[PDB]
Design a protein around this nucleic acid. Structure first.
Ligand SMILES: [Tl+]
Ligand SMILES: [Tl+]
Ligand SMILES: [Tl+]
Ligand SMILES: [Tl+]
Lengths: 66, 66
DNA sequence: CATTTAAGATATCTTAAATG
DNA sequence: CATTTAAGATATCTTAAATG
């Protein structure tokens, strides 16, 4: 089963931006992005919603996929 | 001005259910519900989404008011 | 260079006791 | 009774160092 982190990374790669660039858009460090993408952690409520807008997708898609 | 916890409590009061009943719907303790309502903590990503569904509103409404 | 690892501060949860 | 407070375990961040 596909993890949220893999969905985050795939979406970021489609947008052709670095982790630091996505972090700037969300309001977190590049390391936070790395942690989410590798499923070390999951974004908190505020960060998940900011991340979903930066990635142009729904929070539900990130959390649970299709 | 208005805090997310105030919006959570107002939405729960609209449903007329107890914190424990809401916690059961969301997947957390009554105590987590209390901590969110008192703005002591904020829900994580997964919990924010579950809460918004339980309360029949959007995650953005809870987070920022609309 | 871009990203991951590491250490550490603090937030987010838990169950039990206290409160009203 | 419902809710809050207390104590405590794990999760979520940060910056600095390590990696390739
Ligand atoms: Tl750590
Ligand atoms: Tl009492
Ligand atoms: Tl490293
Ligand atoms: Tl190197």
């Amino acid at each position: 089963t596909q993890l949220m982190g893999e969905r985050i990374r795939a979406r970021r790669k489609k947008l052709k931006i670095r982790q630091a660039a996505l972090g700037k858009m969300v309001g977190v460090s590049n390391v936070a992005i790395s942690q989410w993408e590798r499923s070390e952690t999951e974004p908190n409520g505020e960060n998940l919603l900011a991340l979903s807008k930066a990635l142009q997708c729904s929070p539900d898609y990130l959390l649970k996929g299709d």
